[PDB]
Amino acid sequence: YEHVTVIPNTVGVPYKTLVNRPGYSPMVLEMELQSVTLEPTLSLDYITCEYKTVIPSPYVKCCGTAECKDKSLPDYSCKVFTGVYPFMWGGAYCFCDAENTQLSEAHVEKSESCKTEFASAYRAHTASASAKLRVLYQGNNITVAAYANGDHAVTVKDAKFVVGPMSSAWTPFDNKIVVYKGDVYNMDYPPFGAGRPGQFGDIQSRTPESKDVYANTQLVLQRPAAGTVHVPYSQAPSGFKYWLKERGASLQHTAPFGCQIATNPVRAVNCAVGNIPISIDIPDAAFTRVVDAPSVTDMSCEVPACTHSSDFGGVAIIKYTASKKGKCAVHSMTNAVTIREADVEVEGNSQLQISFSTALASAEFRVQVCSTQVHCAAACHPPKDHIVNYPASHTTLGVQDISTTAMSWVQKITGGVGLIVAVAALILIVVLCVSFSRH
Amino acid sequence: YEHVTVIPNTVGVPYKTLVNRPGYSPMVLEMELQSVTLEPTLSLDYITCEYKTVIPSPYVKCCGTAECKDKSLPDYSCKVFTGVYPFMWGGAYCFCDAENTQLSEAHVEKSESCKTEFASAYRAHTASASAKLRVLYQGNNITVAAYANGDHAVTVKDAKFVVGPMSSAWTPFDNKIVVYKGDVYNMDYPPFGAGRPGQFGDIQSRTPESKDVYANTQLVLQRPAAGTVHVPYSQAPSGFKYWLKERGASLQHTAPFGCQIATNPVRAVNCAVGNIPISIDIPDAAFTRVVDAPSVTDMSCEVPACTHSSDFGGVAIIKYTASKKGKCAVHSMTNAVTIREADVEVEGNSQLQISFSTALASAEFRVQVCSTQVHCAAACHPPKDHIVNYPASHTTLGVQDISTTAMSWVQKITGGVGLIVAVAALILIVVLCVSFSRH
Numbered sequence: 001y002e003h004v005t006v007i008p009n010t011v012g013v014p015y016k017t018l019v020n021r022p023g024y025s026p027m028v029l030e031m032e033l034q035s036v037t038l039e040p041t042l043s044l045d046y047i048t049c050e051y052k053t054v055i056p057s058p059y060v061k062c063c064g065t066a067e068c069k070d071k072s073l074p075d076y077s078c079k080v081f082t083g084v085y086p087f088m089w090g091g092a093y094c095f096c097d098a099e100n101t102q103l104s105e106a107h108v109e110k111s112e113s114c115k116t117e118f119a120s121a122y123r124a125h126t127a128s129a130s131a132k133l134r135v136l137y138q139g140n141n142i143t144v145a146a147y148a149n150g151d152h153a154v155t156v157k158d159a160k161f162v163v164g165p166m167s168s169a170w171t172p173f174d175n176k177i178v179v180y181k182g183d184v185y186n187m188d189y190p191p192f193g194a195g196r197p198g199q200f201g202d203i204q205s206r207t208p209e210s211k212d213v214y215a216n217t218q219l220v221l222q223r224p225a226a227g228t229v230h231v232p233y234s235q236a237p238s239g240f241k242y243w244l245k246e247r248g249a250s251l252q253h254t255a256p257f258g259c260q261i262a263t264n265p266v267r268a269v270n271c272a273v274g275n276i277p278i279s280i281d282i283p284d285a286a287f288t289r290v291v292d293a294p295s296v297t298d299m300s301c302e303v304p305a306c307t308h309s310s311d312f313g314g315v316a317i318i319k320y321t322a323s324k325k326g327k328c329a330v331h332s333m334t335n336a337v338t339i340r341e342a343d344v345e346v347e348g349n350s351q352l353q354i355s356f357s358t359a360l361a362s363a364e365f366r367v368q369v370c371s372t373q374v375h376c377a378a379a380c381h382p383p384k385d386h387i388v389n390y391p392a393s394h395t396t397l398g399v400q401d402i403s404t405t406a407m408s409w410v411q412k413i414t415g416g417v418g419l420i421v422a423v424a425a426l427i428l429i430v431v432l433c434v435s436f437s438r439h
Numbered sequence: 440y441e442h443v444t445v446i447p448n449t450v451g452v453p454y455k456t457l458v459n460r461p462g463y464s465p466m467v468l469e470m471e472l473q474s475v476t477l478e479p480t481l482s483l484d485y486i487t488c489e490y491k492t493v494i495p496s497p498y499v500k501c502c503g504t505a506e507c508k509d510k511s512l513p514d515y516s517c518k519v520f521t522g523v524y525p526f527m528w529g530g531a532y533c534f535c536d537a538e539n540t541q542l543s544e545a546h547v548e549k550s551e552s553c554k555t556e557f558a559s560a561y562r563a564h565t566a567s568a569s570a571k572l573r574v575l576y577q578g579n580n581i582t583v584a585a586y587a588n589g590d591h592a593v594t595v596k597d598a599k600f601v602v603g604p605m606s607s608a609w610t611p612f613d614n615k616i617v618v619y620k621g622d623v624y625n626m627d628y629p630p631f632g633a634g635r636p637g638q639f640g641d642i643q644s645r646t647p648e649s650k651d652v653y654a655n656t657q658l659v660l661q662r663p664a665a666g667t668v669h670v671p672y673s674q675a676p677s678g679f680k681y682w683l684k685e686r687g688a689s690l691q692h693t694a695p696f697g698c699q700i701a702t703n704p705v706r707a708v709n710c711a712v713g714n715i716p717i718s719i720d721i722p723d724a725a726f727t728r729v730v731d732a733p734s735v736t737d738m739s740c741e742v743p744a745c746t747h748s749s750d751f752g753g754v755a756i757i758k759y760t761a762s763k764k765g766k767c768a769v770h771s772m773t774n775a776v777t778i779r780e781a782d783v784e785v786e787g788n789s790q791l792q793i794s795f796s797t798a799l800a801s802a803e804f805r806v807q808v809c810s811t812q813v814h815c816a817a818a819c820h821p822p823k824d825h826i827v828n829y830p831a832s833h834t835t836l837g838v839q840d841i842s843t844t845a846m847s848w849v850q851k852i853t854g855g856v857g858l859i860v861a862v863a864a865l866i867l868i869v870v871l872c873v874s875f876s877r878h
């Protein structure tokens with residue numbers, strides 16, 4: 001037997017559904033959603049880290065001319081200076097006091113620490129979805145897990161379950177994301193091979209194990225100070241450290257709809273969007289014939305209390321006469337009132353007690369117990385507590401939900417006004433006809 | 440200095456573009472596209488292979504009653520038969536002649552061969568693209584390779600190249616594909632856990648190394664024959680072998696646009712759709728000043744032959760006087776005529792020879808040689824060969840492209856008819872004016 005239902009995407013709230021098959025007693029199922037997860041598909045682009053500067057010992061040539069050649073190393077620079085006269089701790093180094101030169105050079109390499117301290121950029125694509133459910137079936141709790149689409153099915157206790165697809169494709173991730181030790185940021189990083197001297201992306205490589213490194217820092221050699229041997233230079237500071245000090249709030253704290261974020265692997269969970277259809281296949285052996293179930297012949301209802309708070313603040317007592325001992329199901333016949341208890345045991349001549357919640361200021365509803373129905377009514381009072389720590393268990397109201405006292409006042413005024421118009425209209429009709437016929 | 444061009448997505452055809460910078464001599468570049476590759480993103484769903492049936496020795500209990508219990512193994516079946524009287528080579532087995540029973544059972548397992556002979560299903564997502572180019576630059580051939588989007592650049596001989604994005608998103612793959620040893624098919628395979636007894640997907644698993652196996656075959660035990668010991672059964676044949684004998688043609692033979700396919704990894708090659716923009720950055724050192732290049736003062740043109748075939752069927756001779764020896768670039772000033780030669784050498788007083796192709800029945804064009812212009816004209820004859828083995832090297836013609844003889848005939852006929860109308864109008868006007876004034 002095929003049954004189809006729809007459940008809204010709310011975590012931590014039970015829902016009930018009624019199964020009705022001709023010739024058999026009705027059955028009621030209860031379901032609760034525990035978790036929903038989305039998972040995107042990623043592709044790596046490049047990584048960044050710190051740089052190192054390498055400077056060899058200088059070469060000083062006095063009373064001769066020095067020169068140097070070009071090299072293929074990254075950010076290579078070479079310059080020759082004239083007029084030097086270096087000193088050491090023991091006196092002047094060379095005999096010649098004029099026509100001296102000095103040669104200096106430097107280049108840039110990748111830091112050893114990049115194996116541990118680094119950041120990576122990813123390109124994002126369409127995400128998948130999965131869900132986990134609890135089902136109350138034949139008085140026992142069972143669990144299922146499945147992908148949230150139509151291409152998967154599971155079987156538990158000879159019942160088949162299919163879930164999905166989801167009604168919405170909203171995703172909290174952009175096309176370009178950056179991940180660093182548990183944080184995810186939305187950032188439009190610069191193209192590969194087009195970096196900047198003082199921002200994110202000054203050093204680029206494809207993978208931590210590669211040898212090919214790109215750099216776009218500035219490096220200029222300067223004239224040495226008189227009497228000292230050293231190699232001064234000017235260079236722009238590393239951009240990676242600058243980012244760490246100003247990167248700001250992470251995606252976890254700013255995302256809408258209450259989503260939570262994880263990074264290993266990247267995930268987003270419990271996003272409160274849309275609804276999820278469900279389909280169940282129930283085997284024939286689960287049903288009991290109407291000739292075997294007990295019958296109930298007489299009912300009455302009273303309601304001693306009602307407060308329309310967010311919780312189960314209502315109680316009702318129903319009297320019954322049963323023909324024999326057995327089990328019976330209970331279900332509400334309205335949408336504005338929910339009943340907590342799923343079933344009862346009936347015997348002889350006695351009474352049963354149930355609890356309910358509702359938002360109505362004046363409540364009227366019907367309750368069905370083993371194929372018969374009873375009418376209940378009561379008035380409800382407001383609560384006193386301004387703020388609570390949990391969501392409500394009931395649906396919202398519409399324009400039709402009005403107190404019976406207010407409805408009476410509306411009818412009286414509208415009727416009265418209509419009567420004045422109706423009488424005046426009749427007078428005009430009579431006068432016109434008399435004039436017509438007299439002429 | 441930036442230069443932006445567009446080249447159509449056709450493999451094996453050269454194209455030329457003109458770079459013109461005030462103060463410097465013009466430069467001509469030539470480019471050719473060698474290959475384009477598309478690569479989709481895949482995820483694995485399930486695999487299929489062959490099945491095995493396991494049957495242990497039967498147990499026979501004569502003049503006693505056998506029984507058996509249920510087990511959790513896939514497709515487990517158990518039955519008891521009465522009234523057996525087995526024989527063996529040496530005589531009847533048991534002393535009792537009546538009240539004998541036999542117990543039989545079987546179950547289904549996964550074949551050992553599944554490690555080598557199997558098929559896999561994938562879900563497809565948005566593909567990436569890459570390209571390989573040849574460039575003629577500074578008189579030498581260089582090559583580049585890049586991703587076909589705006590997020591990548593390369594540097595060769597101090598020139599920067601950016602290629603892409605593509606103008607079209609057409610992809611030859613569907614959402615669901617199946618791959619088997621080099622063949623790719625589009626197939627809507629059944630969902631997991633919902634197979635059929637005689638079709639593709641009767642046995643399913645998640646990965647070749649899994650222990651969890653699903654099967655939906657039929658297996659029924661039958662009564663044994665009199666006087667023998669055996670275990671007959673009825674079972675549906677394997678669906679996997681049926682597919683292999685009936686799978687039909689693969690995408691490589693049926694796909695549109697002439698696309699080629701490879702499977703390791705899955706790729707589509709040389710699909711002829713759309714066009715590709717390109718941007719180049721040329722350094723200043725490559726340019727030569729107009730004061731240093733030679734000048735040409737006198738030009739003439741003679742064209743001894745032209746046949747407008749698909750190949751280069753035209754020849755022209757140009758006369759020149761040059762101020763000094765040097766290099767010179769040539770370029771066509773029209774769209775309907777393409778010139779094969781990119782550069783010439785000029786010295787003294789001499790002549791040069793060029794070749795061209797066009798579809799025009801009557802050709803007229805200008806040629807630029809070192810910043811001067813020469814005018815050429817000719818009539819062309821048709822070819823005699825019906826079919827060739829290569830695409831044309833020239834553009835198509837429009838409605839305005841008409842031979843000079845036909846144009847003269849059209850003008851004469853239209854002019855004559857128009858003159859007759861003009862005269863008749865004048866006569867009518869004068870007569871009407873006379874009547875107006877006289878009345």
Ligand SMILES: *[C@@H]1O[C@H](CO)[C@@H](O)[C@H](O)[C@H]1NC(C)=O
Pocket residue numbers: 115116
């Ligand atoms: C731990 O160290 C390994 C290398 O030894 C590195 O790959 C990894 O990112 C480190 N993890 C953390 C949390 O620092």
Ligand SMILES: *[C@@H]1O[C@H](CO)[C@@H](O)[C@H](O)[C@H]1NC(C)=O
Pocket residue numbers: 139140141
């Ligand atoms: C298990 O079922 C019982 C009813 O017999 C119910 O009270 C309980 O909440 C269920 N367990 C969970 C975790 O919901």
Ligand SMILES: *[C@@H]1O[C@H](CO)[C@@H](O)[C@H](O)[C@H]1NC(C)=O
Pocket residue numbers: 554555
């Ligand atoms: C070769 O055999 C291995 C297993 O031994 C299998 O995984 C692979 O697909 C085979 N390749 C071909 C081309 O048959």
Ligand SMILES: *[C@@H]1O[C@H](CO)[C@@H](O)[C@H](O)[C@H]1NC(C)=O
Pocket residue numbers: 578579580
């Ligand atoms: C390579 O350059 C030469 C000129 O030096 C040219 O003739 C040749 O056609 C080029 N190669 C290709 C494949 O076009």
